[PDB]
Point group: C2
C-alpha cells in the first residue's frame, strides 16, 4: 500500500511526502523532503480532516482516534528537511488509517501551520 502528499502553504514551504506500508499490521515508511523551512526543528503531524477549503486552518485537530504525531523534522541551513521516518502507530488501513487526512508541517518544534496537503492513494 502506497500514499503520497504534496505540501503547500501561503509562503515558501513546500514538499512531497511518500508513504509505504508492506503489511497491514506493520510500520509505515514515510519519506520525502520539505523546502522553505527555517533551520531547525519543525512539528510534523497528521490532522483529522482532509479539508483544505481554508488551507491548513480547516484540517482540524491532530489525528488521534497521539496517533497523528510523527515527531519533528529537521531543516538544514538551506531550509531543506529530509524526512525519513518509520512509524508503527499510523496505518494505511484500519482504524489508524491516514489516507484522506491532512499532513501538516508546523512553524515550531513539537505553532502556526506552514504547509499542508491531503494524503492520497499513490501508484
Amino acid at each position: 500500500t502506497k500514499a503520497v502528499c504534496v505540501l503547500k502553504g501561503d509562503g515558501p514551504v513546500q514538499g512531497i511526502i511518500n508513504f509505504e506500508q508492506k503489511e497491514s499490521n506493520g510500520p509505515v515508511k514515510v519519506w520525502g523532503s520539505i523546502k522553505g523551512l527555517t533551520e531547525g526543528l519543525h512539528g510534523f503531524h497528521v490532522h483529522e480532516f482532509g479539508d483544505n477549503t481554508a488551507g491548513c486552518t480547516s484540517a482540524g485537530p491532530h489525528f488521534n482516534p497521539r496517533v497523528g504525531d510523527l515527531g519533528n523534522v529537521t531543516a538544514d541551513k538551506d531550509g531543506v528537511a529530509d524526512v525519513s521516518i518509520e512509524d508503527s502507530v499510523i496505518s494505511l488501513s484500519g482504524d489508524h488509517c491516514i489516507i484522506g487526512r491532512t499532513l501538516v508541517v508546523h512553524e515550531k518544534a513539537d505553532g502556526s501551520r506552514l504547509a499542508c496537503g491531503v494524503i492520497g492513494i499513490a501508484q
Copy 2:
C-alpha cells in the same frame, strides 16, 4: 467516513469545492458544490485513480475503474458566467469499501464526457 470534500485547483482559472455525503454505509453518495472559471457548456466530471498531485492533474492516473466506469460522475454544466452548480446522486461510488474514493482525485475536464485536458483537480479528503 460519512462526509468528504475536495478543493479543485489547476494551472488556469478553474476552481471549486465539491462535497460528498454518504450517511448510510453502501448507500447512495450525494455530490454537490460549485465550480467556476469554466467555458460555457458541458465538462466531464471524473474520479481518477490516484490522489497524487505531485505533477498537478497529470499525476492523477487513469479514470477510476477497479477491475476487481465507477469514477464517471457524468458531466457538469457551466453557465454563461462560467459557473457549474453541481448536485448529483451516485450509487456506484462510495466513501468506503471496494469503490471507495477517499484519497483519490476528482477531476473536471476541458470537454464533455475523450473529455480532453484536465482543467482542475483535487484529492478527496475526509470531512467528517
